[PDB]
Amino acid sequence: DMSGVQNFIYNISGSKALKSLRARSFYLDMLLEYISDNLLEKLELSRANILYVGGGHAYLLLANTNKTKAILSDFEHDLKTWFLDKFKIDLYVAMAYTEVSANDLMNHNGHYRDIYRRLSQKTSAKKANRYTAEEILNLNHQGTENARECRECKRSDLLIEEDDICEICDSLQKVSRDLTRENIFVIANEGVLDMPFGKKMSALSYSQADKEVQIYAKNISEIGQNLMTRIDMGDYTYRSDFHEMLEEVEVGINRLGVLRADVDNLGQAFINGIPDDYLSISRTATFSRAMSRFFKNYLNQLLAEKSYKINVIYAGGDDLFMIGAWQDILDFSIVLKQKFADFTQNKLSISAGIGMFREKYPVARMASLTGDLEDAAKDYTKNAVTLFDATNVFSWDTLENDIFVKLDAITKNFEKLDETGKAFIYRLIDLLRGVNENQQINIARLAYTLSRMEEKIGKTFAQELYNWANADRKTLIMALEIYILKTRE
Amino acid sequence: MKIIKLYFESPVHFGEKRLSESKITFSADTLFSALMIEAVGLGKEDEFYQLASNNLVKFSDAFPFIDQYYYIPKPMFNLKLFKKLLYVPIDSLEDYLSGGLERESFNLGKLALSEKVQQHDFKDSEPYNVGTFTFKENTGLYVLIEQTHPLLEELLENLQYSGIGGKRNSGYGKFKFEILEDSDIEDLFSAKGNRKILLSGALPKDAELEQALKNASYLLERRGGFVQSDTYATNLVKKQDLYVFKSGSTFENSFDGDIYQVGKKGNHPVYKYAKSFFLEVS
Amino acid sequence: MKLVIEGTIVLKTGMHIGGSSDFSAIGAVASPVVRDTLTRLPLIPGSSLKGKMRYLLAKELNNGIDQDEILRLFGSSEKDKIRRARLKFNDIKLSNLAELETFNVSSTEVKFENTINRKTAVANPRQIERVIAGSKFDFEIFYNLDDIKEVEKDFENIKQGFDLLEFDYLGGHGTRGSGRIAFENLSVITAVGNFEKINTLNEILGA
Amino acid sequence: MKLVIEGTIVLKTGMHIGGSSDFSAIGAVASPVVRDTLTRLPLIPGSSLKGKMRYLLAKELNNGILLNEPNNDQDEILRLFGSSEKDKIRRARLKFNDIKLSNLAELETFNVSSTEVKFENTINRKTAVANPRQIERVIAGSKFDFEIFYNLDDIKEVEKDFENIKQGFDLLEFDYLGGHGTRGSGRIAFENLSVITAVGNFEKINTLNEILGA
Amino acid sequence: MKLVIEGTIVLKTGMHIGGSGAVASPVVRDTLTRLPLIPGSSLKGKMRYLLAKELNNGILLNEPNNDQDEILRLFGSSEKDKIRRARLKFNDIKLSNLAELETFNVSSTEVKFENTINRKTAVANPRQIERVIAGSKFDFEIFYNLDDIKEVEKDFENIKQGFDLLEFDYLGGHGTRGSGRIAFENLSVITAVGNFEKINTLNEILGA
């Protein structure tokens, strides 16, 4: 159970911190992959003993022997020491285990929920008492005084002598420069990205992989002879540089759009979503594999189908984070909800939050307040989307049906075009917001105003627009807002 | 035991590693450093450190308050059987612990971001951005003290017209303070209990750390930064990183911390208040 | 040994300081002004007032050659020169909004400007939010008194910065109309520490 | 050290600057002038006056045409009105202020409003019918007391700069200020043109005040 | 370089410009001094109509943006590409000779009474028309800015053509029914700042 993963990915202080988010998310995911695979190597177990290696956590089934517990204690101590010696408090892996039996696995006497209940209890107990006394003493003993600090990750240890930059953070910069749509990843003694246990990772492609080594590929070419392990993540990037892809779009405002979503109640549907009479270890395995398979593989293929201007930072049910052109974020959110509902047969709900920002907005504040619009959507954990602000909370069906037929109608009949007709559009938007400040003298003014503004657009007003503008609908002002945001310089 | 309610008249900035990011409240390190700077302004830092080291003044981290309701961080209890909850009121802790008990929403204000530039005459100007936090109209922060001293009040009044937090000379941080001795909070603090909740960013000394970590649910917090003075080392320099427990932590054994020295290679010492402040519950 | 200088910034012409990107209302094609985030009322940042006073004071001084008057009044952090600033500026919010509600008028306006191309004789309009003229901003700036032998020269420089700013603008498109201010009710009261010559500062700033 | 040039823009004919289609139900009058939002006075913006002086001065230093970008003006125009290039960026020596109507008392003395409405046709040569249009204008004879801040940073250029400033005012004497000026309106004239110093007396202020008051 | 063309508009008959107390159909006046006024829009529009109709093959039916190059360069344009700045610059013209009119002990304007005798009724339904009186004079000046040395001769020929075209037509109001007849006199051209080389030829092709 890796802790502080969002704090590792989004809390980076760089001016060019947007180019390293995929590198940091990749680093954490493949870090957990290699840690689990290394433990399975130490226990002489196959990779079939991974039930789920996911975003931030892994689950292993392994034998209840004293030799196994000895290897587990040594592995936990070495992993803890390596994580302290690189990421002081900012990253922690909690290795907790419980004793389960075969009648307990088979749900013969109940207790199959109790496996993961005991495991979550022991993992939270390990997270509560994170360190020992000696580790805290060595943390406080290594503090020095120095007049230097990294630009991005802002630590003063492991700085390079030639430039004020943390070594691991610079290695993330290098691998961000060397991450493509086809790069496989190789872990060996020499490499770019520092890893346990005395190994480093290069992210090299492709003929340099003729090299002792473990090779991690997103997609495998040949199964048998080529002999590498297939590890998938939601690594869709459109252009891997935000200024150029923001300069590519030309119709709307030049703002960056952030989508943060999660499935509603992973934990509840994961421990007590299945009925008790159908519980099995294989059914938990196939549910976890189905959800991860959807998010990673299917989200990559839907994004590559219609080439959206979207960079994916994190993919998974528990947390999702994509960023790109805000028009393509708004276009892909509805099709993400639709295809998730097609995958899960409407048995699971997804709550999203959109946010629009400049490119030079701070990335940590960006992710943090996109997450606070996320929890504003989760207040309403239902079908809910917050469109760029915490007060503009909709549902998915309202957004889909009402907002898109309203936007299509507005883009149809508002494309006359006219020059002062746009001034009329902003005028009516501002006074609809003025009566949205809840004064009915303003709606008396608007009753006077409709008599002024029948003839400005012509006769296309009094078929659908007047029925939407009956009593200051929030749907109409949001559709007009996204229309005038989609139509600028 | 007394209170120091801080009613703010301005946006604050209480950054953690940033200028662009801020938190809703500050800690005992920052208030001790601010009072020490106001003591060296009026030449009483030898008296103030001798008061603070001998436990004549003992103040917690600053904590939120909305209308007649004093808040503390959600204590990390290691109970067996509200993840978005972060602050539970201090009086409601007994019936928060006795069952799964949400009565009213917690709203203090909201964060902001100021957009500023560094203007140049014959060059393109440099944008930068300061993350702030504006309190609501009848909210603020409070600090718990006991056995108050006239030096503490003099230093607080001097800090009142100087600023708390970061970017204080550039528009932020002004407040007013009031003592307002309460009866319910002091009766809540005088009562003993089997389990004690930490309330300041403390770190036990090296001969009591093992005793402190017995049945403990803690969270370490890196508390460092740059030295703010003029007479230290004739250039900007980062103090020693000190990892203290976070203020919401909860312990079985008691301890008293220390005012650790994080600056040694300079003309004057630099101190870090990691003394312990506890609240007993059952 | 810690002083308070109180006053009011009235606006002879409108003012366009700053801009929020908080999605408050960025739909309207008009560059917005900085406002308080919980009242949404117009705001003069303390950094803007501080920086424009520093700019005009460091340009009126330092001619033909910054000097230690500017650094001791506004703070500095160089490789060898580090000084604490003596002035503590605060963010200034709108004062006479009840007086602005007697006239049934908003706290802020919008100003239209074209740009006539000389080649093609065509205008593209643009809009600017301005806080209107007749707005008043009650400010207080805190001075701490490290040395009595420099306080009178410091206050002479502060009044020099104030009337130098009264012959310039405060942020935004000031060459093309806006930004003009006028400082009034400038007075000094000591906050903590009784200062024996306070009336001389009250007359060198209140003149 | 900074100089102030104060004068008066008197309207020889009507003048129509500016307009926002106000949300109040004013009735059956359209196209209002830009007004001061608090004191309800009609206003001459400093942006309009600055742009028209810059165009007429850049046009006057001519032989040939004026067709360029404002940043690629003549170097005297760039040193008077400012330029913003990537490297050759010059601070503007002039600071304009928004000018509001001064002699409201004198317009009230003759018992007449501060702004009026002029009705105006456009007869289409096919149909020969007229469509009347209300254009709100400011009454001629209204006076607008302006002040422009001149910051002086080179003594060896101030005489040429004030020569160019007086030439720009003279070029506005034979052109219009804002609005439908070719159809009659907009004609202005500059009166009481004088220069004073903000703080600290300029030694050679007499030649500026005599080539500005010529 | 800029030129000023100055003259006088003397009213041979009555005139009545404009409209919109307790009386019917007032004239458009000065708003401060209450002087009767020729709007420069009206003089420019009537001059543009007559000059565009004479600088054409007889009649004029199209929009003012679609005129000849001489007319469009003399009076301005508004196209998406072919936008031109006007060389003429007309002004509102107030009544000059209140001294001459006040000498004759007559008001500057007077009220004209006239009926509409319906044919099947033979009854009067009278109406009042305010008219500024005949013999009134209107000193004008139009600012001509010089952009082409090789076109000022043709521009001034067209300006004199517009002047003596307006001498044989009326100026605003009920013109065919008696009102509006003007005549131009004291026509001259002067230079604004810095003398033009060929000013004598303009004074003799405009002083004829």
Tokens of B239: 């103090």
A319 assigned ligand-binding residue: yes
List CB contacts of A480: < 8 A, sequence separation 6 or more: A410, A425, A428, A429, A432
The strand pairing partners of D145, in sequence order, are: D8
User: What does the alpha-carbon distance between residue A297 and residue A235 come to, in Å, rounded to a whole number?
Assistant: 9
First to last CA, chain D: 24
**What separation in angstroms does the CA of C72 have from each of A66, A375, B269?**
70, 47, 24
* Residue A69 marked as a ligand binder: no
Q: Which residues contact D195 (CB under 8 A, 6 or more apart)?
A: D3, D4, D5, D6, D150, D162, D205, D208, D209, D212
Question: D174 and E143 in contact by Cβ < 8 A?
Answer: yes
How many whole angstroms separate alpha carbon B225 and alpha carbon A312? 33
Q: C-side interface with D, Cβ within 8 Å?
A: 12-14, 60, 100, 103, 105-106, 109-113, 116, 118-119, 132-134, 163-164, 167-169, 173-178, 180
Distance CA D20, CA D33 (A): 8
Q: Is D167 exposed, middle or buried (0-12, 13-18, 19+ CB in 10 A)?
A: middle
Instruction: Please report the residues numbered 83 through 142 in chain B whose beta carbons come closer than 8 angstroms to any beta carbon of chain A.
Output: 84, 111, 113, 127, 129, 131
Residue A318 assigned ligand-binding role: yes
**Minimum CA–CA partner of B233 in chain A:** A147
* Residues of chain A found within 8 Å of residue D23, distances taken between Cβ atoms: 427, 431, 445
Cβ–Cβ contacts within 10 Å for residue A132, how many?
14
- Rounded Cα–Cα distance for residues B3 and D203 (Å): 64
Strands (E), A49-145: 50-53, 58-60, 92-93
CB contact under 8 A, D91 and B121: yes
Quick check: helix, strand or coil at residue A480?
Answer: helix
Question: Which CATH number does the domain housing residue A250 bear?
Answer: 3.30.70.270
D85 touches chain B (CB under 8 A): no
CA A201/CA A197 separation, integer angstroms: 11
Mark yes or no for CB contact D91/B124 under 8 Å. no
Helix and strand numbers, DSSP H then E, in chain C: 5, 11
CB neighbours (10 Å) of residue C202?
Answer: 17
CB A259 within 8 A of CB A323: yes
Q: Is A29 annotated as a binding residue?
A: yes
Known binding residue A308? Answer is no
Cα–Cα–Cα angle for B229, B230, B233, rounded to 5 degrees: 95
| Helical axes B28-41 vs B45-53, angle rounded to 10° | 150
Give the position of tokens 């009784």: C194
Residue D70 is classified by DSSP as G
What is each CA distance from C154 to C68, C157, C200, in whole angstroms?
11, 5, 12
SS (H, E, C) chain E: CEEEEEEEEEECCCECCCCCCCCCCCCCECCCCCCEEECHHHHHHHHHHHHHHHCCCCCCCCCCCCCCHHHHHHHCCCCCCCCCCCCCCEECEECCCHHHHHHCCCCCEEEEEECCCCCCCCCCCCEEEEEECCCCEEEEEEEEECCCCCCHHHHHHHHHHHHHHHCCCECCCCHHHCCCEEEEEEEEEEECCCCCCCCHHHHHHHCC
Note whether B36 and B271 are within 8 A (CB). Answer: yes
SS3 B111: strand
Peptide bond into E170 cis (omega under 30): no
Residue at B145: amino acid letter: I
CB atoms within 10 A of CB C41: 15
Q: Which two tokens stand for residue A198?
A: 């005395």
Burial A388-400 (b: 16+ CB within 10 A, else e): bbbebbbebebbb
Helix, strand, or coil here: C121?
A: coil
Q: Is A430 annotated as a binding residue?
A: no
Consult the annotation and say whether A2 binds a ligand.
yes
CB contact under 8 A, E32 and D112: yes
φ, ψ of residue A100 to 5 degrees: the values are -125, 160
β-bridge partners, B75: none
Where exactly are the structural domains of chain D?
1-214
Contacts 24+ apart (CB under 8 A), E60-67: E60/D125, E61/D125, E61/D126, E62/D125, E63/D124, E63/D125
Give the structural domain span for A362: 242-401
Chains E and A share 3 or more Cβ pairs within 8 Å? no
* Minimal Cβ distance to B242: which of A13, A143, A364: A143
| Tokens 């590519």, residue located | A248
Contact C43, C35 (CB under 8 A): yes
The coordinates were experimentally obtained by cryo-EM
CB atoms inside a 10 Å sphere around CB A110: 10
- Is A3 annotated for ligand binding? yes
Task: List all chains that touch chain A, counting a touch as 3 or more CB pairs closer than 8 Å.
Answer: B, C, D
Tokens of C120: 């093609």
Spatial contact of C21 and A255, defined as CB atoms under 8 Å apart? no
Three-class SS state of C175: coil
How close does chain A come to B218, measured CA to CA in Å?
A: 6
The resolution, in Å, is 3.0
Give the separation between CA B67 and CA B57, rounded to whole angstroms: 27
CA distance linking residue C83 with residue A100, whole number of Å: 65
Judge contact between C18 and C34, C-beta under 8 A. Answer: yes
Query: Which burial class, exposed, middle or buried, applies to D75 when counting CB atoms under 10 A from its CB (0-12, 13-18, 19+)?
Result: exposed
Would you list which residues of chain C are within 8 Å, Cβ to Cβ, of chain E?
Answer: 120-122
Kind of pairing, strands A385-387 and A350-357?
parallel
DSSP letter string, C6-73: EEEEEESS-B------SSSS-SSSSBPPPB-TTT--BEE-HHHHHHHHHHHHHHHSS-----HHHHHH
**β-sheet bridge partners, residue E130:** E111
Q: Which residues contact B181 (CB under 8 A, 6 or more apart)?
A: B1, B2, B3
Q: Is C117 helix (H, G, I), strand (E, B) or coil?
A: coil
Q: Residues with Cβ < 8 Å from A486, sequence gap 6 or more?
A: A251, A252, A253, A327, A411
Q: Is the peptide bond before D149 cis (omega within 30 degrees of 0)?
A: no
Distance CA A403, CA C126 (A): 29
DSSP states of B129-193 as a string? EEEEEEE-TT-EEEEEE-S--HHHHHHHHHHHTT-SSSSTTEE---EEEE----SHHHHHHHS--
As a whole number of angstroms, the distance between CA C181 and CA C16 comes to: 12
CB environment D105-137: b (16+ within 10 A), e (fewer): eebeeeeeebbbbbebeeeeeeeeeeeeeebbb
E138 DSSP β-pair partners: E9
Closest to A307 (Cα-Cα) out of A293, A292, A328, A286: A328
Cβ pair B84:A375 closer than 8 A: yes
Counting one residue from chain D and one from chain E, the pairs whose CB atoms sit within 8 A come to 78
E3, E4, E34, E1: which is closest to E140 by C-alpha? E4
- B119 closest CA partner among C84, C168, A363: C168
Give the DSSP H or E segment for A432.
helix A420-436
Give the single-character DSSP code of D34: P
Q: Is residue A98 a contact partner of residue A119, using CB atoms and an 8 Å limit?
A: yes
CB atoms within 10 A of CB E65: 13
d(CA A409, CA A475): 13
Residue D170 host element (H or E): helix D158-173
B116–chain D nearest CA distance, Å = 20
Question: Which helix (H) or strand (E) is B71 found in, with range?
Answer: strand B69-73
| Contact criterion met (CB < 8 Å) for A431 and D25 | no
Q: Locate A441 and state its tokens.
A: 């003298």
- D40 and C134 Cβ atoms separated by less than 8 Å: no
Cβ atoms of E189 and E4 within 8 Å: the answer is yes
The H or E element spanning position A186 is strand A185-188
CA angle centred on B174, ends B178 and C34, rounded to 5°: 140
Q: Is some CB atom of chain A closer than 8 A to the CB atom of C112?
A: no
Residues A247, A250, A254, A259: what is their CA dihedral angle, to the nearest 10 degrees? -90
Phi, psi dihedral angles at A174 (to 5 degrees): -65, -45
Chain D residues in contact with chain C using a Cβ-Cβ cutoff of 8 Å: 1-2, 4, 18-20, 34, 36-39, 45-47, 50-51, 55, 58, 66-70, 81-82, 92, 94-98, 149, 198-199
